[PDB]
């Protein structure tokens, strides 16, 4: 998961 990449959220920034």
Q: Which two tokens stand for residue 2?
A: 């990449």
Give the technique used to solve this structure.
X-ray
CA gyration radius for the chain? 4
* Non-local CB neighbours of 4 within 8 Å, separated by 6+ positions: none
Furthest C-alpha separation in the chain? 10
Q: Which two tokens stand for residue 1?
A: 């998961």
Cα–chain center distance at 1: 5
């Amino acid at each position: 998961l990449f959220l920034x």
